[PDB]
Amino acid sequence: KKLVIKLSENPLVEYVTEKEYNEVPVEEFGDALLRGMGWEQIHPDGLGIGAKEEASFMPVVK
Amino acid sequence: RVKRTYEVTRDKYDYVFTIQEARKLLPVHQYKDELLQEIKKNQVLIIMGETGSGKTTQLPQYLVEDGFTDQGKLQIAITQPRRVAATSVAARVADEMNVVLGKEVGYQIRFEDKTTPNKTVLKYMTDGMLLREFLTDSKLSKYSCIMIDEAHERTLATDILIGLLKDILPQRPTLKLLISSATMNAKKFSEFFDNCPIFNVPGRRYPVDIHYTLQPEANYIHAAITTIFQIHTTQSLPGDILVFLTGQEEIERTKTKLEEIMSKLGSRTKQMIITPIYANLPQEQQLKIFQPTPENCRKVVLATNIAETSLTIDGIRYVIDPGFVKENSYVPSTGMTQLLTVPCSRASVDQRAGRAGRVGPGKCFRIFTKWSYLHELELMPKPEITRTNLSNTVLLLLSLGVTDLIKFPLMDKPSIPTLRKSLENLYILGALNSKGTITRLGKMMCEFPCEPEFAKVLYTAATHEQCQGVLEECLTIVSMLHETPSLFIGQKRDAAASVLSEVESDHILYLEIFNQWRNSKFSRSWCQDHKIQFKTMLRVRNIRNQLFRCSEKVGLVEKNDQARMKIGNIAGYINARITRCFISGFPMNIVQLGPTGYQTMGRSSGGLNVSVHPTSILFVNHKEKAQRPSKYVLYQQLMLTSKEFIRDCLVIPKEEWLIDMVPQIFKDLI
Ligand SMILES: Nc1ncnc2c1ncn2[C@@H]1O[C@H](COP(=O)(O)OP(=O)(O)O)[C@@H](O)[C@H]1O
Numbered sequence: 259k260k261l262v263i264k265l266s267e268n269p270l271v272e273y274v275t276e277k278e279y280n281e282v283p284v285e286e287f288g289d290a291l292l293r294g295m296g297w298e299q300i301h302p303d304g305l306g307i308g309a310k311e312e313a314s315f316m317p318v319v320k
Numbered sequence: 321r322v323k324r325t326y327e328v329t330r331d332k333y334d335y336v337f338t339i340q341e342a343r344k345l346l347p348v349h350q351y352k353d354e355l356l357q358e359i360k361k362n363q364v365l366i367i368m369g370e371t372g373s374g375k376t377t378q379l380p381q382y383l384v385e386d387g388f389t390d391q392g393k394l395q396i397a398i399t400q401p402r403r404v405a406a407t408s409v410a411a412r413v414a415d416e417m418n419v420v421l422g423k424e425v426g427y428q429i430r431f432e433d434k435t436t437p438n439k440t441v442l443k444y445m446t447d448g449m450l451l452r453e454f455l456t457d458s459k460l461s462k463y464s465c466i467m468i469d470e471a472h473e474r475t476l477a478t479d480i481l482i483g484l485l486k487d488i489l490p491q492r493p494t495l496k497l498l499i500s501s502a503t504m505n506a507k508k509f510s511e512f513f514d515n516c517p518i519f520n521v522p523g524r525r526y527p528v529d530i531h532y533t534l535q536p537e538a539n540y541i542h543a544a545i546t547t548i549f550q551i552h553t554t555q556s557l558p559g560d561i562l563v564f565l566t567g568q569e570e571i572e573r574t575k576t577k578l579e580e581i582m583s584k585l586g587s588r589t590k591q592m593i594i595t596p597i598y599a600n601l602p603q604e605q606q607l608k609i610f611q612p613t614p615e616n617c618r619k620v621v622l623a624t625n626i627a628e629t630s631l632t633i634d635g636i637r638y639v640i641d642p643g644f645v646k647e648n649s650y651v652p653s654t655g656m657t658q659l660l661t662v663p664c665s666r667a668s669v670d671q672r673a674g675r676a677g678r679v680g681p682g683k684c685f686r687i688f689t690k691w692s693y694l695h696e697l698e699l700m701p702k703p704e705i706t707r708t709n710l711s712n713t714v715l716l717l718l719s720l721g722v723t724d725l726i727k728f729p730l731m732d733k734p735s736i737p738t739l740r741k742s743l744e745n746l747y748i749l750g751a752l753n754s755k756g757t758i759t760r761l762g763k764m765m766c767e768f769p770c771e772p773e774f775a776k777v778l779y780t781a782a783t784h785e786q787c788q789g790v791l792e793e794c795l796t797i798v799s800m801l802h803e804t805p806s807l808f809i810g811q812k813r814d815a816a817a818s819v820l821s822e823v824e825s826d827h828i829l830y831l832e833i834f835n836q837w838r839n840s841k842f843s844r845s846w847c848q849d850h851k852i853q854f855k856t857m858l859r860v861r862n863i864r865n866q867l868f869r870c871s872e873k874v875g876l877v878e879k880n881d882q883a884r885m886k887i888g889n890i891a892g893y894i895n896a897r898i899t900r901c902f903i904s905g906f907p908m909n910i911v912q913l914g915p916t917g918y919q920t921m922g923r924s925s926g927g928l929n930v931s932v933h934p935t936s937i938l939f940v941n942h943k944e945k946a947q948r949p950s951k952y953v954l955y956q957q958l959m960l961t962s963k964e965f966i967r968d969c970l971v972i973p974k975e976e977w978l979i980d981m982v983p984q985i986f987k988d989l990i
């Protein structure tokens with residue numbers, strides 16, 4: 259029911275297969291590899307720390 | 321001491337209607353005899369010092385003068401997390417060694433290496449680059465000594481370098497590796513290397529007065545600009561200001577605002593020298609930040625976290641600290657990485673305050689209250705291996721023969737949900753077989769100096785039967801995506817309207833800019849007329865030249881040429897084939913249009929209600945043109961500032977292109 263894949267602890271493979279994705283699904287692949295191994299916020303624009311249209315910031319007075 | 325608490329606008333402002341002698345003053349020079357004896361006794365050594373002690377510059381020079389390089393036969397590798405810190409400090413050591421750069425002292429970053437084979441003695445590298453050196457040479461046999469610098473930063477590439485070098489130390493008895501970091505608790509490093517001795521360099525530092533706001537600030541950027549002026553007008557020279565900003569986008573907005581006010585002040589206010597420091601800073605700008613400031617002038621340095629630990633600017637007397645770090649966060653359950661800016665920990669803010677205390681007693685200004693420092697800030701930083709995609713890491717470890725991958729010794733182990741999603745990503749990309757062995761595609765992806773998702777796009781364009789023959793267009797677009805923030809002067813829509821009247825997506829626009837620049841014989845005059853930075857496009861041409869050499873060694877160029885003869889591409893068919901290549905390379909970054917808005921397709925990801933970023937041309941078309949929004953959008957970057965934003969947006973008009981290119985995901989989703 260739950261398959262196990264052991265890695266080759268050490269001829270080419272061009273594409274994977276159009277069928278190995280059906281024999282081994284994507285979500286089942288990551289679970290099967292781990293069993294062989296053994297195992298089985300928002301910050302607005304420039305807002306300060308701790309606080310909760312442009313009006314150009316000129317702190318300069320005539 | 322309690323007077324430290326200050327108020328912004330303190331009161332607006334008026335406008336009328338031998339290099340060898342300096343090396344001996346460094347603190348590491350007095351400990352030079354004791355330290356070189358300790359390196360000869362012990363194979364591994366942790367060297368602790370204050371930032372600016374001289375350990376990055378003088379320690380490689382001390383090893384060469386002692387004779388560790390062995391007449392130039394053996395090279396010395398120095399490891400940097402930052403790219404700017406690799407290039408700029410190598411320029412300093414070349415000046416001190418009196419050699420020209422790239423001949424006896426060189427650097428190596430991913431797209432440019434200034435290194436000659438026989439003559440180069442000590443080389444400064446990015447931490448990612450020494451990982452790639454394992455694929456060619458597993459023992460690192462050419463190096464006599466390796467120095468992992470800035471190890472307290474705890475980046476991802478540093479952590480695997482500590483893990484990989486741990487295995488090789490029984491194999492090589494003549495390799496000595498030095499860990500150098502700031503004065504942080506190195507007991508964790510010493511436990512990993514089997515009770516390694518730690519050397520501490522005492523640092524001469526002066527006390528810093530640390531200032532806090534009364535209340536939290538609505539805009540820290542406006543508070544930081546005002547703090548520069550109250551230092552500039554009411555204090556006495558010489559004192560240089562160091563400002564810590566999050567990213568290069570906020571630095572350039574701050575710099576043009578700060579230049580705008582100094583033009584209004586004019587003759588009355590003293591001359592301000594504004595030098596930016598950020599991640600993709602050009603090489604000619606990096607010399608500007610280390611120049612000694614003239615008399616009657618104040619230097620105001622606008623920097624990211626590079627100035628915190630990696631490099632020191634001489635003469636800093638004032639530090640302004642907002643307290644944010646922009647970082648990449650990866651969540652394993654949702655399966656995506658975001659660029660988000662967070663409040664940084666207590667240890668990093670204390671590291672930023674120490675920069676004012678180098679040359680004399682200094683002042684540190686913090687835009688956050690003391691109550692938002694005792695309780696609202698974490699105590700230490702979380703390492704990068706806790707939040708990273710790890711798809712590139714696992715593919716590199718399987719190439720080197722790390723089969724077990726959970727008994728591989730690391731200082732901090734990666735989590736099982738992160739490691740599972742990393743294995744599933746390589747299986748989707750086709751880099752990993754269903755039997756689990758690395759395939760011919762996965763060995764190919766390690767060859768390129770890019771992420772494995774970009775190597776899939778270049779493989780698909782040369783090989784895949786629906787997409788075959790658009791490798792030359794894909795090498796252009798991938799090269800443009802590395803240099804995207806530095807492309808445009810001014811707003812992007814003004815430069816986009818000049819090069820081509822109607823563009824659908826960002827990827828096609830980046831193709832059209834480089835082609836018209838190539839048709840103009842790479843003219844500098846073309847870029848000023850069309851408002852693209854010319855210095856950026858010279859780097860993009862450098863990236864394309866490096867990727868084209870790697871495509872020839874794989875054999876994609878020869879398969880491209882046979883394909884281009886057979887197909888006979890028409891310009892309507894080319895943009896369809898470019899779209900399908902990026903679907904196969906980035907299948908997780910697809911967004912479906914919904915009733916509320918754009919929404920992530922992944923069933924683990926769910927509905928996030930992502931919006932299009934305003935810099936993208938897809939936002940420009942929806943505001944101005946009457947075109948309906950596309951149902952499927954592919955993005956390169958995800959960013960969180962008050963809502964999630966996507967940059968570098970591609971348009972997918974057809975639903976079946978998702979199913980045809982990557983059926984293993986989108987058969988269930990569609
Ligand atoms: N590119 C450069 N140009 C000029 N001076 C530099 C450069 N890089 C470093 N320095 C100087 O050399 C000294 C050594 O600094 P460094 O070794 O980088 O600090 P650390 O000991 O924290 O690694 C510093 O005082 C710095 O001012």
Ligand SMILES: [Mg+2]
Binds near residue numbers: 376377469629630631
């Ligand atoms: Mg250093």
